[PDB]
Design a binder for this molecule. Sequence first.
Ligand SMILES: Nc1ncnc2c1ncn2[C@@H]1O[C@H](COP(=O)(O)OP(=O)(O)OP(=O)(O)O)[C@@H](O)[C@H]1O
Ligand SMILES: Nc1ncnc2c1ncn2[C@@H]1O[C@H](COP(=O)(O)OP(=O)(O)OP(=O)(O)O)[C@@H](O)[C@H]1O
Ligand SMILES: O=C([O-])C(=O)[O-]
Ligand SMILES: O=C([O-])C(=O)[O-]
Ligand SMILES: O=C([O-])C(=O)[O-]
Ligand SMILES: O=C([O-])C(=O)[O-]
Ligand SMILES: [K+]
Ligand SMILES: [Mg+2]
Lengths: 490, 490, 490, 490
Amino acid sequence: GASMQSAANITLRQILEPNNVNLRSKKTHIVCTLGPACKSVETLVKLIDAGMDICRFNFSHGSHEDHKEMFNNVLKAQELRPNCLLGMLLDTKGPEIRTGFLKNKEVHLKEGSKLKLVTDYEFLGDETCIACSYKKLPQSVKPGNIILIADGSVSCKVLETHEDHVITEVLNSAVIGERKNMNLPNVKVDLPIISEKDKNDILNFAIPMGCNFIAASFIQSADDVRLIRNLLGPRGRHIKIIPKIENIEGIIHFDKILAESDGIMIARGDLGMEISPEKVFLAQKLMISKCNLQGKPIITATQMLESMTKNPRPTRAEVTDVANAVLDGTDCVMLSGETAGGKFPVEAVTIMSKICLEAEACIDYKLLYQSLVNAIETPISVQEAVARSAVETAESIQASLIIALTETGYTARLIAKYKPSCTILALSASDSTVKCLNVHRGVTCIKVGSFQGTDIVIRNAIEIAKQRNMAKVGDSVIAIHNLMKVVQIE
Amino acid sequence: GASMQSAANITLRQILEPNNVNLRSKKTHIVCTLGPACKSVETLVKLIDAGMDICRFNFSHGSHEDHKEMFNNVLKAQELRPNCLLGMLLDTKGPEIRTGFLKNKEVHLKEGSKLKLVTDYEFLGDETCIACSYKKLPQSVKPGNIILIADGSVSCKVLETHEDHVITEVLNSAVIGERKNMNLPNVKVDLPIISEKDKNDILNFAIPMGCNFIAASFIQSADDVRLIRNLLGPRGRHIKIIPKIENIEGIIHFDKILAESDGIMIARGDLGMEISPEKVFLAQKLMISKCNLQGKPIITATQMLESMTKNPRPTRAEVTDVANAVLDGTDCVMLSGETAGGKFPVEAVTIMSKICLEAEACIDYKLLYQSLVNAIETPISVQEAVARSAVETAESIQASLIIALTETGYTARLIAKYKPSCTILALSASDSTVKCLNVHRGVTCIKVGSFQGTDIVIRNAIEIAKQRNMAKVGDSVIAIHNLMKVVQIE
Amino acid sequence: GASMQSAANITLRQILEPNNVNLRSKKTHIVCTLGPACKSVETLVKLIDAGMDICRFNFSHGSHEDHKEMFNNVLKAQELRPNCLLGMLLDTKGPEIRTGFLKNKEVHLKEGSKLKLVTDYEFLGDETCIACSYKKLPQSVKPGNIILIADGSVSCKVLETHEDHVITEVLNSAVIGERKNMNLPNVKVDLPIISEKDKNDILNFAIPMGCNFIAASFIQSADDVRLIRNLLGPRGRHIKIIPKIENIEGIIHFDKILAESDGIMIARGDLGMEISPEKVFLAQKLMISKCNLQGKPIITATQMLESMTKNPRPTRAEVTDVANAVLDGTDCVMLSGETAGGKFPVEAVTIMSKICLEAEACIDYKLLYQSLVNAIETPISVQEAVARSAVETAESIQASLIIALTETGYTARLIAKYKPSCTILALSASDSTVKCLNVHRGVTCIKVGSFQGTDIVIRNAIEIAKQRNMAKVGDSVIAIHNLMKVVQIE
Amino acid sequence: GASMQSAANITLRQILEPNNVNLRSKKTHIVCTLGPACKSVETLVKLIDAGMDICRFNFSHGSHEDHKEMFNNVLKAQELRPNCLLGMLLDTKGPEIRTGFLKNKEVHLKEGSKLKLVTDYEFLGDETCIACSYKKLPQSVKPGNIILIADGSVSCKVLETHEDHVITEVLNSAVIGERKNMNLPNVKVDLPIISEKDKNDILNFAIPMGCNFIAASFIQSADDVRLIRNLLGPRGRHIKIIPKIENIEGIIHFDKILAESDGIMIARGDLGMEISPEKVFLAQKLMISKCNLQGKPIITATQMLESMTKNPRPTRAEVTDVANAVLDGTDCVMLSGETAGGKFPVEAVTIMSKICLEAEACIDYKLLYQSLVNAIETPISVQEAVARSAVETAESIQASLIIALTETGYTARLIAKYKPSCTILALSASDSTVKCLNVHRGVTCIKVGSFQGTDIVIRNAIEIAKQRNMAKVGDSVIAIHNLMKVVQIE
Ligand SMILES: Nc1ncnc2c1ncn2[C@@H]1O[C@H](COP(=O)(O)OP(=O)(O)OP(=O)(O)O)[C@@H](O)[C@H]1O
Ligand SMILES: Nc1ncnc2c1ncn2[C@@H]1O[C@H](COP(=O)(O)OP(=O)(O)OP(=O)(O)O)[C@@H](O)[C@H]1O
Ligand SMILES: O=C([O-])C(=O)[O-]
Ligand SMILES: O=C([O-])C(=O)[O-]
Ligand SMILES: O=C([O-])C(=O)[O-]
Ligand SMILES: O=C([O-])C(=O)[O-]
Ligand SMILES: [K+]
Ligand SMILES: [Mg+2]
């Protein structure tokens, strides 16, 4: 249980006058799933200009080599955009059930047609016959059952179950590519949380490549989170674990999963295949509420701008979904197929930033802070109080920035919890910190020198803030490191 | 200048437990647009069972012939569903700009290909050449301009402009049928709000057929409402006027439009094409808030479950759009192409009812009553105070129903304003009242045969309520008629 | 414990413009202790005119015959004021320690002088030697102890202890009469809750004379209240038990005492002698809150306008004490020595009415209603719901009266709990009801005939209301009997 | 116009358990009027221990030499108590009307006795004839007029008026001394705001002796305040002007008077004689509410514990008066005759401190700060923001103190406005600041060295706070000087 959503203030002015502010000045961060549509350095720079903050590498697709290439192109895109430090997110395979490979890379499934599902996962399929990664499929499904494919974009009714295959009837026309996700109704999937393939993805890519986050697919318990932490060991001590909530067990054990985790991802695609589509908005709102209360970052994911895979504009529902995720209190929003395989990756990232800018602009921050402080039980730590004091002071004097000097990012995470109206400028001499803080709403990072003076580091930040149009002369800034001070910009 | 959104109480119970209640028990009413996909009595009966409350007739499509056949098949579906009293809504053409007629009724437009937009509206087009209703189109657009087609699901870049035609580039692949809506960028449309074609539809369909509402397209002022009211005359005195807000002028003059109107339609499709898409959510939240304060009913429309024109289940953004429209304070939600030309009309309506039930079970109704009461100024009339108290009493004792005895529907309209947790049972002898109240959230009507004893009317209504499983023996009911009484079911 | 005090609104015009209103129009009711100072029918009539609602007969003073003569003078006063129905309250002796009788009816005790305390209670004393009613006095005190007399107005330090007597030092100058109350420090009084004399006062005066309330001195448990209820028996079934909280045991067991009681008296005199004076204001604010939350009436008693026993004007502290008792939420305020023995009984009652009216005019009834409704947990009974709804409907339409037709008084008590801005006119055929309801803030009673109908009764009530200037033509009145109706005075 | 009162939290524990805490640890400060009852150094030392914070010298009484010997005795007492820095308050005569001098210095006026009131102020009166300071007296009052004496403790009905005297009837029995204040009914007193006697008192006592405050009698306008400021000149620039509101003119112009002043004194004695006594509680609450809003200090004065001039313990009304002034939001409470001429001055100050501590113990500081912040419009100055944050932080971490380094007292006043739960420890090099901040609730000063750094002054303060047990090992303290730092006591 929980109670929700931030108070809005909408004027005619907001609806009619254009919001010409920079797309990178927004508070909500964007997770972009990388793939063929945005592989080039040139597209990665365009995505940075449009508002990309975190890069998602889905290990359910591609290969280590193709992911290694995309990763290095991101590093080259960062050399072209020095004021942008991107977080690197590895999204695991986990205990997934997938469709197979295809002869012509795309099949055009038609409503009313029969589709045979085979267990030979090496088989290159076509619209008449496709493979399933799950060898127990014939024994697991029964005639009448609805197999869901690609976030439920395809529904198949089981007609007959055999020894090695299943005959289905396609219930709707859809075009799908390779290795689409699947859901088998009321089937207890006999698959480990961490497979040998997951182990090779984490140890042989995540740790050597320098990923900041592990988005663990299908987490069911706090024990699963500890298992990954242990797998990561001493070398991966700075890699954050973001469990993905996408099954009933993740919902039931949410509170404990959240306690062990470094943040959460609401994996609505697979979740909306497991539970009734109408139940997902409840699960979304509940999980955001809880995360906001614990000060843990949350990523709202999947089918946010779905139509944008084919159209340069989103539907009406898609706009409200992004806006309402922001007003619910999400730290991040996410783009999946819209960036990885769609026709308009840049225009998808662009309008998402515009929707975030609009939604953030009508939030009632004075009220938002009051509602947080009322929910959080006091006494609180000295660090939390000073962090909170910074947010209230910033709001009272209409300060442009909160500058936090932090090695671990702890101070910045504490300020972020109180959702200030202004940007948080986290200043750190750690490379993991400056990229890990990207998952927290409204936190912008500057990488500083390891043993540099408090006041010189603050002036260099003010100088970069002036250089980035974040603050002008005459403005006030809050500086925090246990103390808080108000500096007038000059 | 508004402030909004109701408080949600979400438990694990709500997420995980199946809701097995009747689809017609929901408070949010559904407007279905009728068309070829639901032309049969069998299908029209399935939509009634699924939760349809108001039938929409888009006079921009079909013919007077096709619409008469449709109207009469609804009357036939009602004979089979006597506990359901549907409202009939005529949606005007208005000062619209449309794509013309097609050779094979449907075309597959492809990304990067050229499209010739001609001004001869008799030209049966193909994927290379399509007619445009606004003869002034070549002199109205300029090279580089983005023409929007079918709620902006098709974007066209003007390459060159000629005397009688325009040459564009199809910026995305899309399949479109006949008479798709068009938006011309920054063009002041020289067309009347009420045309001769519109007058013929109102005077020779709406009045003879007995339409309960006029959804007036592209309303820009209160004088346009006054105009339709005077047009309707005495013969159409019980017909409600529902201005559609779908342009900048409709937004600017919203307050004056609202004051003259009988309710509002948020026509997001054409509005989303007129203003930047990211600004539609702002418009929607502001208008719902303003209507909620005035006690005027509001219909949230377009692209609510768009993906369901092809798939038997919606996207994650579609589910939240509906849920959020309900939590915003909308009275009705609408289906356009999802029921008119879609492949899954019955499943579209069904999931829409399920999302409404799920969102309504969230609302903290005691907090919602308090916020309405705080935002309204005391003193109010004796009539409003008694309606207000019926809602408060109903909530305090957890009453099953609020039974309103009303000729006009005014009492039911007042109770509905205070949004109670239980159903408002509106008892009227008037056929127009009974069918008009369908636009107010949570109002269910019984048509009474006479105006006998005040206690016989109430007793017979409880007997009907019990049979319909709305009320059970031992429940309390509130009866309002100026007084309020609490009655025990026996 | 609890949390408290109602919202005040002070304008300059309230401070400067005179309050010309009738003194009996106030909501807060006055309890006047009757004695030699107000024995005459002539004075009792002026006391009615100055705002007296309940008469207190202190059985610690006088005699049965003297109390009977006064009671019959109250009945003659009421014949001259037929619009005034006084409640009769018997205050029991209880387990009290009293000073004796005096040779000259008064003693002028001088600071520094020695005072001998004797145990022969038949001895008429003087300035040098006064009797004490507690035989165990010399064995109950030790040298250095401070004996408090007359609400702590006299302090005596024990110098020496002997078999049959005690020698003390008068610590302050004071003039005192006979049978003043006493407090012995750290003494658990070896006296019963109800003595044979208390039994005789109850059964031989309260039941035969027809008293409406028993204010029981020194109640320590719910067992004491049940003892009294059983002592009253069938003949005393309509007599209300108002326990007096005047010792630690009464505070410790307050919640259980309150549950059995029909109301509470904050007997601040003795309580102020038993506990530290600074602690009494805490006890008072807590008790009023607990009573207000239960809908049980409370009387704030003792030393409210003390200085007015000698002066025609009160002190600044005395005015704030009365005003603050009203804002705290007391139902009644009491005058003890101010009316029973003082030099200005009429001017004491006059100013008390005037402070009450001034403070009642500060109250924000909308905020007061909201607070109570928030504090009381739902579901509430249908009866309590319609009572609550009559309060809200009256405030919403600015109604002049709440007309409640009740036999037992139950309905009027339910309305009185939600503290309306307007008077509650209770109509009852029961003579006990009509006199008992006086202890409730804002309730005015009219005795109706047993065989009169609802319409006849509501019409005569409205007629009396016009005659009494309680309501005028054009005003709205709420009538409740389970239903609520709004009536226009014509 | 205003709305008010601080929310209480009372438990049985606070009522039954003894609070044996140091009387100088309270937040509310005490203003003591010095007179013959407390002339000795030994008594002044006991008054300091009992909780005296400001010394009032009423120049309406005694001689210039009497006040000087008194001031010197205060200076001597302060040498025995060095951890206590008292404020010196001069109370002017103003445009006052007084009773004359007596040949027995104290007379006993009896009820129903005739009294002559002469205009020759050189006459030594008895109970049959007393002098008046207003020569215009028999040309200002008519038969039936009630002349008031000594805060209205004596009422005098005019029997007849002549040329040099009047004949009145003593309406009550009272013993009075020399120079008692007087109020003439509906008479416009033709006297100056500051007389030549007031001029000599301000210029030849307040400036040379070093008074910190001037409580100016009967201030009517902002022009009167500006006049005193002009008189005080640059020599007395550090002297605070505390206007006394004791007339209709002072209430009508309170806002402009408050704007010009350094604080306010609610002079209830004369005020209660000018307006109806039942209206004084309205004035008190409105004025406190307003002063609290502007963060200006307010003193609640007269008859707070009046009965204590004769008794070692107070009335019930007196306890609620002090307690309720604290809960209303008063900075100081004052003692007049209780300390200047009474029989029990030490016990009066003791009980006053005990009531303060009790009232302060039930204040909800988190709710108080919330209400203050909501009542003050944003943006505010950086100085007010930081000060506000010191309060919020202190409450969040349960800090022991707020240490404010301030030269003028500006910082400490800004903190005092937000009423923290912990003591404000103001540190200043200035002697006037240290003795002026006493008028602000919860402020304690330590006088520091002028040429010492911030960090040496803070660690010295901590060691003094430790010695006084105002802070201890393990505590958090907030240090403010524009910044806020949280210091751990080690
Ligand atoms: N009566 C009808 N007959 C045939 N097709 C219809 C009918 N009504 C709607 N449609 C089809 O469904 C689609 C969506 O319906 P809808 O009523 O929303 O029309 P529209 O083109 O979007 O215009 P508008 O902006 O007025 O709603 C139409 O474009 C059309 O293809
Ligand atoms: N009926 C009476 N006859 C004579 N004197 C009375 C009477 N009632 C009260 N008094 C006088 O008024 C004073 C105050 O009255 P009060 O009723 O408060 O009694 P009390 O002595 O204070 O005892 P308690 O604690 O019951 O109030 C008494 O002490 C007595 O002097
Ligand atoms: O993995 C995801 O993001 C999902 O399933 O939605
Ligand atoms: O007309 C409509 O309904 C629209 O444009 O959304
Ligand atoms: O009996 C009383 O009223 C008292 O003691 O205060
Ligand atoms: O002067 C005063 O203090 C008064 O009148 O109260
Ligand atoms: K004076
Ligand atoms: Mg005075």
